[PDB]
Design a binder for this molecule. Structure first.
Ligand SMILES: [K+]
Ligand SMILES: [K+]
Ligand SMILES: [Mg+2]
Ligand SMILES: [Mg+2]
Ligand SMILES: [Mg+2]
Ligand SMILES: [Mg+2]
Ligand SMILES: [Mg+2]
Ligand SMILES: [Mg+2]
Ligand SMILES: [Mg+2]
Ligand SMILES: [Mg+2]
Ligand SMILES: [Mg+2]
Ligand SMILES: [Mg+2]
Ligand SMILES: [Mg+2]
Ligand SMILES: [Mg+2]
Ligand SMILES: [Mg+2]
Ligand SMILES: [Mg+2]
Ligand code: NA
Ligand code: NA
Ligand code: NA
Ligand code: NA
Lengths: 77, 110, 142, 176, 45, 56
RNA sequence: AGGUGGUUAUAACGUUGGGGAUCCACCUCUUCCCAUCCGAACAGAGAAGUUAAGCCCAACGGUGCCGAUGGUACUGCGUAGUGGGAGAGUAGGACGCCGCCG
RNA sequence: GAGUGUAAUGGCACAAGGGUGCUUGACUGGGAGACAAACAAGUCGCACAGGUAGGAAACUAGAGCAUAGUGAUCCGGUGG
RNA sequence: GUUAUCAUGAGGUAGAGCGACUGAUUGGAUGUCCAGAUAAACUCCGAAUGCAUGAUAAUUGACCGAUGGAGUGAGGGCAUGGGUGCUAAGGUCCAUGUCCGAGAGGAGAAGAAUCCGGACCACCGGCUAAGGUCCCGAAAUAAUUGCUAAGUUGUAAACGAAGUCAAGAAGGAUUUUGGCAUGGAUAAUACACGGGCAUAAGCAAUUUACCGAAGCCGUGGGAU
């Protein structure tokens, strides 16, 4: 009578942080992800852990394209 | 696998970083068996700003210089410098290099 | 006894049967069948007893179909074992069914024999059932 | 081969409208095909009782009140999971312009020789056929007077009329 | 078998690791000498 | 262009969201009447607590 | 009959025919730039030859792709009512639509 | 439907998968702004100055497809 | 700060599906094909709700910073989504609400959390909620239409016989879906509609009036 289980690790709080429509300052973290679930578009950079962050200030836009690939970009002025 | 699937594969690798704006327009070259062409393109607009070719104008490498120079004069009048040179799936060699060298030697920072 | 040849996992969480069956509520193979009116786990021992009963009738002329397969593992702790300390000893497999799901299909026999043969099989089952005849059937040709 | 059906107009749609319709022992129904939009209407359980619960097939001559008159065939019947009662029907409009696939009963009309012993077995009870609606038989007769031993007549090895056997050729339509 | 390494030649030092059973020769890499403000060769000690 | 709303059921054992909707309407006591302009924002508040209020 | 973009294939794939004014292509040879075991690829040097193939045009619902209306499942609130409403399948659509340059 | 040294999951075709040529950015001085969050800790990322590598150039490089491979303070050792 | 509306955004649950993958799987013709079908650790698909941002509206003001003082860190019931257990437990472990805790009043005969309802004080005033109106016990032996014959009722099943009422189907017989009853129905100090007792004073339906709380209103008097 025993269990060989009982283990788990801490969750990483991953996901979208700034949604489409909101305003971002340069440097703001937009998406925490494993791999490129979302892809960097215009004015958006990618970190070592595939973190998506804003290179310029503006409006966050999501956009689906060929093969339902999602891109994240910043719309400036 | 058919002389074009590889070229399109190389084309998209070059286009992953090279594009054109109103400033620094893209310099694009197409090499046929007999001729050679060039084009200045504004990707945001989508329209061509200038062009040159040897259809209506020495070995083939000796004729790419004239194309590489005639594209400079066309851009010199329109007020273009510091273009960006894309390979278009072409190895930087031979005729294509002479076209790039002539464009750089003129008024463009190709 | 009807059970998977192999499984990917040894244990399974006890799920939840929610509504009426939306698949397997229509006869496809035979002309007569029995359909459940309750949601319940059906064991392999229950199915074997019912199938032997219906096959014993109709002599040796006709074909019987089992339209459910028990693929859900279940466990049981046993006597003198307190709550906790993990899952219990394995106890075979069951098939969960919802109201409307057809269990036994019969073909090759006249109307009256089929009605009686599936009545004996339904009396070995833990759920109340209902006789169904296919709507394209002809009473004047059997 | 022909059935007479009529139906009342249907206006409201949705969960509330349909549930109230069947409270009067009615069935929601639609008709569509070829040119023109569909028609929403209401039939009754008594009216369609002999159209569906039957070993026969018919070319429905449908007269929807308030809209017009058409010709149609049964396409889809929706049954309740537990009560086995009809809850929805859609009729496909048929015209004399292009064929339409439908399945007609096939009848094994004496048996070949002494036969292998009470076999005379009808396996494939229905066969898909595409043709003009006025060329589809009420039945698919077969004469069986050869190979009393172990034999089978396939779907491909048969030619009836200006029909088209789409019923999954290289299959088996009778045996023994 | 992966140990610390200290490349040398105030003085300029760089700390790094290497497998002492795979790379058996002393490490010699060109690095930026802050004191001289130019690249020089740093060898393992 | 106005509309009068009366509370007729208690707010005991109601979800916090419904309790907060009555506050946004101004209702804090049984049988109390409030008056408002019948705009789409106010109408969505009444529709959320329709089982608790009356239009009078 | 070319180059280069936009639109998430209704755009793709495929099938059967047509095309050589000029273009694109296959094509001929490796002394040179450059390359692999091999000028097959990549590169250079030519126009002696062909439309056979890629390529473009017409027609085709063939494989994929898009897809209703109605009905149903599910569900928020609420204790039968009041709102939201799939997936699958069926009628159908579709052999692209737009810019710039030569 | 393979691979990605190593569990699982997510990702990867312009490949992040496989080859070669040259190389040491597995840089010195750095942290606008964010994620995460009892605290202690953790995570992603500048601008530009100095000097490099690859490249025709544009450009990329402050280690590795990502997420585990760990241990405070006190007390001692070594180099400036 | 909150709630509603509008705009914008990212989802992979419920459901569904399986020639869209992996695993599992039924019957046929014969790896090929035709049907049938499954999953917490399957997904070609995919809601309702919820979540984030902005604007407008309403909102007794409900939010935040600094700084003085705390207590708490044994919870519990119910509903919904689940794991575990035996689809046991007034069981156990989470999530979302709610109430008891720290909450009196009314109904339920008598019950911490079921139904109604949040008690400033007084009153020999009035209107209502849940639930009721033959008597104990406040208010209809009220009106109208059916059902039940079992005192069922007024506060369990597989399986029999179909006792009776309504609406049909096929063609006196069979049968289908509803409604109410009947057998199955079962231990130990004496038993239960709470009791009397009722053939309606039971059940279903519609209608009016009335009764009913510390709820609301009225009158007087205080407080923050
Ligand atoms: K009671
Ligand atoms: K009163
Ligand atoms: Mg985790
Ligand atoms: Mg719909
Ligand atoms: Mg900072
Ligand atoms: Mg499910
Ligand atoms: Mg399923
Ligand atoms: Mg403690
Ligand atoms: Mg505790
Ligand atoms: Mg408990
Ligand atoms: Mg539980
Ligand atoms: Mg306890
Ligand atoms: Mg309380
Ligand atoms: Mg009295
Ligand atoms: Mg006793
Ligand atoms: Mg009061
Ligand atoms: Na745990
Ligand atoms: Na609902
Ligand atoms: Na759909
Ligand atoms: Na499957």
């Amino acid at each position: 009578g025993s269990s060989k289980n009982g283990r788990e690790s801490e969750s990483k709080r991953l996901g979208v942080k700034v949604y489409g429509g909101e305003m971002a300052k340069a440097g703001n973290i937009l998406v925490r992800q494993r791999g490129t679930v979302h892809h960097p578009g215009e004015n958006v950079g990618i970190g070592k852990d595939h973190t998506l962050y804003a290179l310029k200030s503006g409006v966050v836009v999501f956009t689906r394209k060929k093969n339902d690939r999602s891109y994240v970009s910043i719309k400036t002025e | 696998v058919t002389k074009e699937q590889r070229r399109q594969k190389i084309k998209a690798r070059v286009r992953g970083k090279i594009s054109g704006t109103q400033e620094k327009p893209r310099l694009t070259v197409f090499r046929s068996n007999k001729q050679i062409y060039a084009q200045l393109i504004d990707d945001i607009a989508g329209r061509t700003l200038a062009s040159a070719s040897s259809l209506k104008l020495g070995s083939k490498k000796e004729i790419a210089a004239k194309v590489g120079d005639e594209i400079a004069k066309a851009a010199t009048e329109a007020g273009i410098s510091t273009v960006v040179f894309d390979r278009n799936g072409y190895l930087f060699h031979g005729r294509i290099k002479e076209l790039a060298d002539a464009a750089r030697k003129g008024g463009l920072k190709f | 006894m009807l059970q998977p040849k192999k499984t990917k996992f040894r244990r399974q969480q006890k799920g939840r049967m929610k509504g009426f069956a939306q698949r397997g509520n229509q006869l496809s193979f035979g002309s007569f069948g029995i359909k459940s009116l309750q949601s319940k786990w059906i064991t392999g021992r229950q199915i074997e007893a019912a199938r032997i009963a219906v096959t014993r009738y109709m002599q040796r002329q006709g074909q019987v179909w089992v339209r459910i397969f028990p693929d859900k593992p279940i466990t049981k702790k046993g006597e003198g074992v307190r709550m906790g300390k993990g899952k219990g000893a394995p106890e075979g497999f069951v098939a969960p069914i919802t109201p409307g799901r057809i269990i036994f299909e019969v073909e090759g026999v006249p109307y009256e024999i089929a009605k009686e043969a599936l009545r004996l099989a339904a009396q070995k089952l833990p759920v109340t059932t209902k006789f169904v005849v296919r709507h394209d059937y002809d009473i004047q040709n059997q | 081969k022909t059935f007479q059906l009529t139906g009342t107009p249907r206006a409201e749609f949705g969960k509330k409208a349909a549930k109230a319709i069947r409270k009067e022992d009615q069935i929601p129904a639609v008709l569509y095909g070829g040119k023109g939009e569909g028609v929403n209407f209401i039939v009754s359980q008594d009216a369609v009782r002999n159209l569906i619960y039957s070993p026969e097939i018919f070319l429905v001559e449908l007269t929807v009140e308030g809209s017009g008159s058409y010709k149609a065939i049964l396409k889809e019947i929706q049954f309740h999971p537990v009560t086995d009662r009809i809850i929805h029907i859609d009729f496909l409009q048929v015209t004399d312009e292009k064929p339409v696939v439908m399945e007609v009963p096939v009848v094994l009309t004496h048996a070949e020789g002494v036969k292998a012993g009470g076999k005379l077995s009808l396996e494939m009870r229905k066969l898909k056929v595409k043709a003009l609606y006025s060329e589809i038989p009420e039945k698919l007769d077969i004469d069986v007077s050869d190979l009393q031993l172990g034999k089978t007549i396939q779907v491909g090895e048969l030619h009836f009329e200006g029909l088209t056997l789409m019923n999954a050729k290289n299959a088996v339509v009778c045996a023994v | 078998l992966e140990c610390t390494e200290h490349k040398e030649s105030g003085i300029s030092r760089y700390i790094t690791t290497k497998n002492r059973k795979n790379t058996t020769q002393r490490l010699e890499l060109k690095k930026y000498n802050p004191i001289l403000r130019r690249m020089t060769l740093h060898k393992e000690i | 262009a106005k509309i009068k709303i009366q509370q007729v059921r208690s707010r005991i054992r109601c979800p916090k969201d419904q309790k907060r909707t009555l506050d946004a309407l101004g209702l804090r006591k049984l049988n109390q009447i409030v008056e408002h302009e019948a705009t789409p924002s106010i109408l969505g508040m009444v529709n959320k607590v329709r089982h608790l209020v009356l239009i009078v």
